[model samples]
Target: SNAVRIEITQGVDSARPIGVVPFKWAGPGAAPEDIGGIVAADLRNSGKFNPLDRSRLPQQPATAQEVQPTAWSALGIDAVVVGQVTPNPDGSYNVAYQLVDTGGAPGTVLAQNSYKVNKQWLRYAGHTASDEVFEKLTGIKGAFRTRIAYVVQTNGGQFPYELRVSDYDGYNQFVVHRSPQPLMSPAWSPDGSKLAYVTFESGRSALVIQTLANGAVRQVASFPRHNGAPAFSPDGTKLAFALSKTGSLNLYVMDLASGQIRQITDGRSNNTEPTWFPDSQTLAFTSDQAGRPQVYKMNINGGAAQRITWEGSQNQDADVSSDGKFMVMVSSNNGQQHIAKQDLVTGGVQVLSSTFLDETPSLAPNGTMVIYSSSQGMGSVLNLVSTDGRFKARLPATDGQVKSPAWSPYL
Candidate 1:
């Protein structure tokens, strides 16, 4: 419901210090969204930039021309961002942003751009502008434009469970599905247009895919037993999930067009929690075949399964980065469960979270942050940690306890 200050860890000194000047509203009463503030928050959340507080801003400059490179440089600021928001007569908005770099010399414009968006899209307009400034400085694409879907269990409501989608920063939340029975494991499609989730509507589990735009729901998997842990391939052509029609929960792949199902794992070992690699040709899944839960990878085209994790007693709920270089999952060490990230190349493991009870580590589209469910004092809440392990924050759901967050790809 409000901005949560992200605690900087050991890497604060390495962060780039910058400032975002509050934007000028050219028309109407009040800016529909705090475009400049949103940009600043996004930058701060990345753990790569330290934006100056608005109250501490040296001066309010409405344009790049007013920014003095020497002044910002003297304050140890690497750059200064100035912008403005103008309204269109026909229910749209134009947002302009200028990034002035002061790190090298007197302030020089590094990037300048503007875009028009509909009234309802003003939030995304701010996020899109933030991405521009982010990529302009870091050379890496920003994930501000992405969304997240999670499961919400309400204490008192018509429905006990609701599937909600919101911006990565936890704004603009709206429910896509509600049920009296439990709802769990909400997964986003590659294109961010639909969500596949588990609903126990008729006293049994079923996997359903709902189009975000039209609210059209499709019962993709209604097997006899548990139908959960649904994940979409990177290409958006196939879905990978765990079903128990054969008695034990095992992985399966479904062709969206033909509805042809392909079994990916044997039922004897109880394989579950299947997540696709970026290539869509391989899968990282959890299995008890090794006597305890551990992460393993196997090619979807049929190949020998390889165990990829060795540092934890139990590692489950794995999510791989889009670049296919790192994997994040819940690792239990000495009876304490925490979120751990593994380097695919060197096979190095680093625990990114100190919270002992963590689940479902979901990686951002740009690989900047990882959102996962953690047990908090209040209840179960969502937590954010930079992939680099530099920043930490909490995202508590206002309506209820939240879990199973799924970050969407860039739209």
Candidate 2:
């Protein structure tokens, strides 16, 4: 029974109250990056947070202890993030941060965390601090500290695909793997330490996992059957993917620690593109079990699967938001492929993409934005759309087609 109350919205106002203050450095050399600024930019790009102007702060507070709750409360801000970075004698540095709810009296210390920073991890350290503070204040984990790995193909005659990882804002693009062949479906581990993807090796599509700490690549499942859609569970202990070894395309879960394989769905239906829910107890996938390809949800432990889409005749490639409350998927409701969001509780679906061929939708960990690939004229390009289905932007790519965008969980 489709009894869930749906509140579908086609437009969202670009305003969600948030405040971030400049971080004050303590006993340090010049802070390499304006971490607070970076965090503010990152949150703003999500299209969910409307950062309060620093000019509005009654008093500029750099540290949590320096925060004036009464001053910010007057501005009607809901939350504020404050922090500072300091140099350490050991060549590393320390970053301390806190998120405060200043809407109430005396303010509430939502979170406080410290990061150990080094030359190689300075930016990462800043993102970690931002992530912690955001999660504590919003009750939703932040993807600001997370990274996304995708395949970028250069356009110099032959299509050259390079596996690259970049910050959530599309900066600091680092090449992880490169090949003249195609690299597709890069999946991030729950801990944001590794990637699982399909790479063409020796003329066959092979599933490979690449560790981010070191440039180590390992082949986990390379079988005669087709293997794709590799996704790690929320705990990072298992991966759910699609395999055609069962005669038809079906869903399977493989244990990362034990190397054990278990089938989650089996039938005449083609079940592909599986995504794990945040709790790791449920999986949302694309299947053609009910006549045409549609989105379905089932438990990781295995049982009856429930259909989640009725507004669209064709829906595929579904991804759950980091908070596990919403899901983003590609839907063809009016004979156009577009990215959309579905509320788990209400079963309400809202179209978020204006592009005609939007596919492979992935949500940022904060549950505010999604990255997907769509057609720009004749060329396929990667694009980012907000969770509210309001703002949309394209990823700067001077390469071939960029597809299969996966946002890494907070590190």
Candidate 3:
């Protein structure tokens, strides 16, 4: 199935119309993967660029020399990407790609790159190519190369919940862990070598960290009552989590190396869902200490909690952006749930999702897009939206409830 067609929804008004010509295969037999198609889909689904349909492409060009400016400009294409894939005798491949400007000096080259890859890395090569094109055009770092970690729960299956990791467009997916017990809050380490999540495999809620390299599981918190909402610090040395030792849940931080634990918040109300800032010195957590659920910021060393959000009646599950200037959160007002983005600098809040019952919002590594779980009648599906609230896409889910999306850092 065509990946982009299934996920891409309506785009915003400012999306640039670009062309991605089919990449030529210089190999003798069929190319291992459609490198051009992968790049096109990656750019198209990003919502920042509107790649012209393959059927509408005037011609396929493998390099800048073959790109025709008049043909592309006539079709309202300001820019285009062209490439070729060549297989090597040692079971490797060389992919050369170029981004051309339609009006610039008439088929002028904007950016060009050549990549080396094997059969397994061909798709990632395409993604890296897309990242280059995206960064060149928008001046913003691209996230196509990043992966997403999420929880997929099947109701009737033997293993009800499974932790999964996949590419940004839902490709190259593999199971990280499976459990009969519910698995929730899949958090990726800053280095992307480990995944931290919560499950009830021990007959009670416990937070565990599993290394993705060898599938090594390490118990981090099996505290009394509840231990969940695990979040890795940006520095990768500490983990911020929520624990309920004396009734109401409180925020706690642990040294990942020495396994030393320290309580950060000890309020009477529930304090949970801790997300760290880019500086790794502060955290944004959900708390009801101020009456209703609201997002608050706290220093990791020692300080009083300061409220950060006041736009919704209840706000929780807030994730900080890569720049530490914005927070995307799940906001509830009038019983309607939606994802909201709050500006930490200007103290402005804006609704980013139209769908109700939005949950578990997380920002992309580049801070250009967001992935959150949105309700679709019964079972929930993972949804992606640009941080500007323009483009939206729903990832494919098969007979399961998908939620708790965590976007991995740039690898």
Candidate 4:
């Protein structure tokens, strides 16, 4: 399958070196998936681990009992992962893996687990193992099992836009919605079962929510003038969006079950891109009420908005981390737009991207990286950067331009 390829533009200098031995396939036929390769790729892309080439491994150990830490230690590897995939008579597969610390003892088991899943979900099983290994080593939750929603433009903006959902690595892409007009702001629901986005099929703008499992669609916001920038509340009971019904764009929240709407912000200044904090009580949105587009936060219950960003001349399209300790936004300065990270505690800012035109920055579920749209020559593509700006990579589409990436919550 032709999937999005990642090109590492910069890499972490102090990534820990580890070895992942190829899994032993004790099955009737060839293994349906390469669990070892998948795990290695996931760790490598995180910019925290340097997975040694499989060919360089001294021996393939499917269990900690079969590992010799001296061999891996000689290769400058501190950790080793070994696993096996065994087929069951019921047509399922058992994926068992163990992580060993080579620097500790001869066979110091750091982590071990087993999962039984159908053959079709073999890839996800690999992701599960990867997450376990990552969390055990880094003390942080891994986002490898999560998904991302992005918009791909075809025909060079002629027609037919596609909104796609794929794994975090841009594989197993499934089209969520396709339109002859345009689609933007693909926001995942809190539970990761549905998506809310803006579509132009109704001639004007309208907000639509689609179920990922059964392809069910519902128009949640179809107002008089415009309806766009849909964001799901943390509780999944409400949706915050931008509406320009009264000739002025403002933020509004809609109760999904009751069909009642509440205007959260009302002013001459345009308030858009509303994102919820972890508390679900406050929302971070983009507003130009201070003469320039900047990020502001306010209580979901009507209250005065508080400015959160002042370093950049312009900041818009805010996305808060799951912990609500940081925010990523498109900050413009000196005629160039880039992605900037803001610390909510110390009010300090750090630019995470150096692209000429960056927009729609979305944070990963674990808050380790930010994925955003960036200009690539004549077209725009997606780029991922670590929060500290130490590592960078690009997720370029094979056919057309890709943008508006929305990272899903941890599944």
Candidate 5:
């Protein structure tokens, strides 16, 4: 038997080189803005491939007929994308696109599509095109079609909290709910259609679900105090949250379909921050039952729980990796709270964050990066770090204190 199931190597250096040309419109009408820049940005953010700059293009091919593969080859471009948008009769548009491999003799169209567009849906066409291009090149579906929803805490002399949603790269942020009361625990539905979170309103904490396409919200459950940590099951049938209504802080499972709840833990010690495992039959959470706060694992049916952490002095907010072999969590062992990843087999721990006061480390659907909240300078901010702990940077945030970031599954 092999000791290692999977062997990982450092670099491949076999990324495909591609170029996107600005689209041209027919007649005297002005062309719709070229969304190639946005598409390129999305692919590069994955850290798998590189995109060629439009400024370096030797031949500006706005159409398939105008493209010259020999010209692009001289410019060091391997693949070329050409597209155009034309006005339709009923106040709409038709966007036609094609991707060409410039290295071959004459340009070869690898992918092509035509999209009917409205004023509001012009960017949607761009994202769709990006998804096709990324998949054809990388063999993985693109996440550009999805958006991210997070909590933005506006703190002044008064505490004003707002739940916001934005693009995956932190652009086009818009508030879904704003109130003086605190809002936390923003989670996305499995279908990427809605979000479920805990909101404080009218002196009470409540679990609310809001549709992303619209601003409609439904209250799942509300208690007297501490209604937080909302997480959807892998199948999106049930929601796991923390409630203190029953005397002590504990984890509870609520079925979204039937609106039925079953309390999982009744311990006197604190039990919160519940997350579903890959099988959705088990949950991992933080508890102080072992004398200090640490990560624990329990079944959804509420049986004998098991302790999954022993590396640090205090570890909280644990999340299982997508592959189910590793876990990412926040530990306070090294002076302050920082993000750490634990190997389930060897029980070895590796710190992933260099920032101070980091918490809530969440793995991306691709298992390439993690999003967490950290305290920097005078304010708290959201940050993303690669899974290998190499590339680290803060996510885009407005003029507010943001925290408790959770990444959505594959879109």
Candidate 6:
């Protein structure tokens, strides 16, 4: 079953067309999963490819020798992906796939790969296959296998808040933590093994690191005043968080091993939401030094902060891309807050989301799309938008509002 039903509100007409035929199944009973559909959905979500509808395909091929390139080429498809799922004697499944160029000679196999996994892991296997197909076509790697952590407010003014983690497409959700108090700012570790977040469980804001493997929790920052907006460094050896233990809310970095805390920003203005660059030397954070909240960058060694955004009246909750080439932030033009992407080198800002009251923009590990929180009605919901503003989709919740999405690094 397709766990996520994506509605393409907008997309680029120039997107390349591809065909993913239904995978052949040789299992005992019904196919454990729809590997072809999973691959197609993953490609479509990228906003780079337009997959041919399964019902529209004239022939459903399951191997490179069986693929008829002329059939797909006649339908204006540049590439075609075909595969088969077979059962193994050891109770696992063997998933084999092939990517062929429809524009080239018939049966021209571009790439072929296979994976052996249990039935429960078939979805992940499909995602891995999609990544291979994506990278084979486009030079960039795919973020299909990455996970996402987000906060869901189940009940309005309710006691317990839920922190959930799922696949990049909002599938296989698991509640990592639930609290009667507020939970916010979920940041993933560099290696994707743990999460560092702020929880008000002790009646005061504190930073806690929880291992995803065993659910073991440890308090890393529990100061007198506010201790929030925890972000992991690129190397995972340090954590940069917002602390108000000093006179005002400022940015600080704590050495994970030595437990030594170093103040990164010592300004009279509020400086919070510290995010690390790929190099791990520079940090981007939100500051109100100019009397308005805006994104700024400074060295981890405590140097002068350089303003990164000036187009919006107010910008906060900044998250930098993995490449350190761009940053996403909640920018307010008038009174409405929207997600905007700012290019660090060109100084150009593009509003990627049109949703109202959007916040907490987290860029994908590959820097292709951003997942953010937006006001849908009286409550908010999670939205995913391409960096180019060419694709938009929503992760609808049947329960309460969802916010504070944190896109994890590639595992």
TM-score of each prediction: 0.95, 0.80, 0.96, 0.96, 0.83, 0.96
Q: Give lDDT tens digits, candidate 3, residues 1-411.
A: 112113666676567888998888987777778888988888877788878888878998777888888999997788889998988889899988998999756778899898888887888899999999999999999888998888877776678788888887777778899898888898999888999999898889989999998999998889789999989998888999999887999998999999999998877989999999988889999998889899999998998889888777999999998789898999888888999999999998889998768899989899988998887776778888888898888775775788888999998
Clash pairs, candidate 5, are: none
Q: Cα lDDT of all candidates, in order? A: 0.85, 0.77, 0.86, 0.88, 0.76, 0.87
147-185: candidate 1 lDDT, tens digit per residue: 888887888667988788888877777888889988889
- Stretches off by above 4 angstroms in model 5 are 1-17, 27-30, 64-77, 102-106, 154-159, 212-216, 321-326, 342-350
Pairs that collide, model 4: none
TM-score of 5: 0.83
Q: Cα RMSDs of all predictions?
A: 2.2, 6.4, 1.9, 1.7, 6.9, 1.8
Please give, for residues 207-304, the per-residue lDDT of candidate 6 as tens digits: 99999989999788888999999899888789999999887998888898888888877768999988899888898888888988988888987568
Q: Output candidate 6 Cα RMSD.
A: 1.8
Better of 1 and 2 by TM-score: 1
Any runs in candidate 4 off by more than 4 Å, and if so which? 156-159
Error of 3 at 392 (Å): 1.0
What TM-score does candidate 6 get on C-alpha atoms? 0.96
Clashes of 6: 0
Q: Which ten residues in a row have the lowest lDDT in candidate 1?
A: 1-10
lDDT by residue for model 4 over 1-411, one digit each (tens)?
Answer: 335667888988678899998899997677788999999999988988889888788998877889989999998888899999999999899998999988866588889999999977888989999999999999999999998899888774455599998898988888888888889999999999999999988798889899999999988888888899988888888999999887888988889899788997778888988999987789999888898898999998877899989898999898998888898898888898999999998899999998668989998889998988887766778999999898899998887888889999999
